[PDB]
Design a protein around this ligand. Sequence first.
Ligand SMILES: [Ca+2]
Ligand SMILES: [Ca+2]
Lengths: 100, 154, 96, 51
Amino acid sequence: ILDTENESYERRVTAKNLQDPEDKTPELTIGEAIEKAFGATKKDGLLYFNDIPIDESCVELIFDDNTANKIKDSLKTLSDKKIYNVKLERGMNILIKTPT
Amino acid sequence: GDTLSTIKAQENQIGNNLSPGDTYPKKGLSPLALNTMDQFSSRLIPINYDQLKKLDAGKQIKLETTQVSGNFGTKNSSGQIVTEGNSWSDYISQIDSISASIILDTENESYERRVTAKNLQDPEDKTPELTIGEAIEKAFGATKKDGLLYFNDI
Amino acid sequence: EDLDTDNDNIPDSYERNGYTIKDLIAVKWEDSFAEQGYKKYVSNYLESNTAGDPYTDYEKASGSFDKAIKTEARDPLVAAYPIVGVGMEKLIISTN
Amino acid sequence: LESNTAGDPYTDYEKASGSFDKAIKTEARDPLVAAYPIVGVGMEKLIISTN
Ligand SMILES: [Ca+2]
Ligand SMILES: [Ca+2]
């Protein structure tokens, strides 16, 4: 969900579960999933919708409690430790609000 | 500033035929009444005392069209024109989405045409590119004399 | 290749290696269409509908569905899913 | 170039040969004329029940 001024967007993105291998859906990181489900544009590594950037250091990004727990569990077991590189999982209610 | 009620013409106010440029109560007859509210044409539109007092005080009550539903006519294997389950509502959204509107407001008349426009954002749409003037000429049947557009004499 | 385990029009080698749809047919991706407008779709080759929406992978990729769907719902991974909601404006209470 | 010259449901051959409905006036036999009823309603008089 994106909550820009006087507008909203409520996209859905497919996610793959690794607990029982028969699904062959490609694995999507959250950042490229956002840029895929929103038609965003890349300049040199930043995401722009029309003229408002969307990035971990430029937006207010809020999870649910379960989603935040899943994110935390999948960050200390990595190296970059940046959210926009976290494997997507089913049942993740992200919410992005751009600054005023 | 508060809507009174929304009503859909159930059975006694359905226009069987509407040709372009012609009203449903063809000119010469009288307008049609709209009183019943429920589905089986058995009810009257009720208003309460405050709204009646506002009506009698001098306030004006307006009617605004919200939507219209109606079929079109196709041909089956025979030469029989069929109009059943052919609701224009199936195409309204797409036509408004992929086309641009052009309105003309000559005296005691109006024209509300739609012209297809191509977007250059994805190299899959292959609709020919139309300029505004030649789109007007194409969508209005206008005539060119030496570089000017005439509809009939204006 | 030529295998089609899902019976759509996209074979199960492009369906997982990357394909683009031009002239209503699927072709391999080589990044040369990068600076032209074409996108790169990747889907699942064991199901007809990757996302779950009624339109299939080929219909979503080519653009043969209802022409009022936003381009963000173009690639198979994204799903066409309206979120229709009701916003209340006011009340009028008739006192009988 | 058209199956129905006039526009009425019956085609040219059906109208010409008379293989169509037999209650239609002979003036509609030729394709140029159209089989088209002009049914109208004539009022006679009202009765008002005063409740
Ligand atoms: Ca396939
Ligand atoms: Ca597939």
